[PDB]
Structure formats: C-alpha cells, structure tokens
Amino acid sequence: MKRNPDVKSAIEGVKYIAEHMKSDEESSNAAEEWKYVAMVIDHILLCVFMLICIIGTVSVFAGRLIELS
Amino acid sequence: HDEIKSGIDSTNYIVKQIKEKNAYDEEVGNWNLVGQ
C-alpha cells in the first residue's frame, strides 16, 4: 500500500469549465481520503479475522484432543 | 507572442486526446455488437 459580447461569454465559458474542474478535483481528493481510510480498516480486519479464525478453532478442540492422548 | 503559441498548442493537445478517446470508444461499440 502507498505509504464583442460573444468573445466575452466565450472566455467566461472556458473559465467556468476550469473552475468547475478544480472544484471536482478537491471533492475527489476528499473522497479518495475516505476510500483510503476504508481500505486501511479493511486490512486491519482481514488480519484480525484470520487470527480469530485460527484461535477460535483451536480453542474449541484443543482441550479434548489433548486430554485424549 | 509565445503565450499564444502555448495556448494554441495545448488546445491541439486537447483535441488530440479527444479524437483518441473517440476511437477507443468506437472499437468498444464494435465489441458490444459482436457480443449482441
């Protein structure tokens, strides 16, 4: 994991098509931060759940299988 | 002067990127018709 009245309205058009992109880019960075946080949480829970899968499977059968021998 | 040239060549870069995504999209439409 990564550690004339026309040329004016035109210019205005272009400039809007730029500001809007910038805005979208901050919104997208913030959503990427939330997605990174969810991926980190997901990696912690993969390790935790494989640990529990092993521990809780040994802690149910170990006693009897050890006293049987 | 140069400023103009710069804008005039970033507009060409934009046109090129567009004409080059349209191709990719045409070929994906062809793959969709093949599947249909």
Binding site: I11, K15, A18, M21 | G7, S10, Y13, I14
Partner: peptide, 20 residues
C-alpha cells in the same frame, strides 16, 4: 489582455489535468 491571460491559463490547467 487580462481576460486573455485567464483564458491562456485555463486552457493550460485543462491540458495538465488531461496529461495527468
């Protein structure tokens, strides 16, 4: 040319977002 400057800089921003 203030308007022009803003245009010549918006086009640049666009081409940059495109390259990236």
């Amino acid at each position: 040319p203030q308007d022009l400057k803003e245009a010549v800089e918006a086009i640049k921003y666009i081409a940059e977002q495109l390259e990236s």
